[PDB]
Enzyme design. Sequence first.
Site, short mmCIF file in Angstrom:
data_model
loop_
_atom_site.label_atom_id
_atom_site.label_comp_id
_atom_site.label_asym_id
_atom_site.label_seq_id
_atom_site.Cartn_x
_atom_site.Cartn_y
_atom_site.Cartn_z
N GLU A 62 1.15 -1.01 0.18
CA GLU A 62 0.24 -0.22 0.38
C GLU A 62 0.35 1.00 -0.08
O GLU A 62 0.74 2.33 -1.15
CB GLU A 62 -0.58 -0.13 1.10
N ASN A 98 -7.60 9.05 -6.23
CA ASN A 98 -8.45 8.12 -7.02
C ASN A 98 -9.57 8.81 -7.65
O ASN A 98 -10.05 9.73 -7.80
CB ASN A 98 -9.31 7.31 -5.92
N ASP A 121 -12.95 8.23 -8.35
CA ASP A 121 -14.12 9.25 -7.24
C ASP A 121 -13.88 10.59 -6.52
O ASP A 121 -15.07 10.76 -5.75
CB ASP A 121 -14.53 7.96 -6.59
N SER A 139 -11.65 10.77 -4.51
CA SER A 139 -11.25 10.10 -3.09
C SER A 139 -9.87 10.26 -3.33
O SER A 139 -8.76 10.43 -3.86
CB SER A 139 -12.05 9.41 -2.75
N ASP A 142 -6.03 8.31 -0.72
CA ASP A 142 -5.44 6.93 -0.07
C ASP A 142 -5.26 8.07 0.95
O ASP A 142 -3.68 8.53 0.62
CB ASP A 142 -5.02 6.38 -0.50
N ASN A 194 -8.98 5.50 2.91
CA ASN A 194 -9.47 5.96 1.87
C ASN A 194 -10.52 7.25 2.47
O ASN A 194 -11.42 6.80 3.79
CB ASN A 194 -10.56 5.21 0.86
#
Length: 128
Positions: A35, A46, A48, A50, A52, A59
């Site tokens: 990760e 990301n 959408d 969002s 991380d 998220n």
Amino acid sequence: KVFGRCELAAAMKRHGLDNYRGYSLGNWVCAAKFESNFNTQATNRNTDGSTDYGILQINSRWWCNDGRTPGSRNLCNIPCSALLSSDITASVNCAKKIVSDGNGMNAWVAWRNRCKGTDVQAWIRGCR
Ligand SMILES: CC(=O)N[C@H]1[C@H](O[C@H]2[C@H](O)[C@@H](O)CN[C@@H]2CO)O[C@H](CO)[C@@H](O[C@@H]2O[C@H](CO)[C@@H](O)[C@H](O)[C@H]2NC(C)=O)[C@@H]1O
């Protein structure tokens, strides 16, 4: 901060992740490796809208507030920036909620694709 492998294992263990929800310590170390490459400061946007955050790439649509994510639920009740700290406490506390929410560690895409089913204990080899 970029954790060493065994350094992170020890911190995760102290914080009660070893076998949390039945996931052995190596699963958690492997997840962090893929990760964030053990970097507490890691951030990634990301599609959408969002982002991380942190060692476990938590998220912002679901778990933390970054003030810019549509539909954000902030289920860990924490600003996303707290998940970038050199101290992993906040990320661990939030990860415990994430992994308890129904899908276990499948919540971490890199864990599913790169850790699940593998010899994850190898991630804690040599650690005391
Ligand atoms: C760690 C984390 O925040 N996991 C999220 C997951 O985040 C991924 C993201 O999908 C990737 O695009 C980028 N990296 C992140 C970390 O690997 O996103 C999941 C949805 O895409 C989300 O699962 C949903 O969780 C809520 C709350 O537990 C559930 O109600 C939903 O049913 C879950 N949806 C699905 C499809 O599993 C992770 O929590």
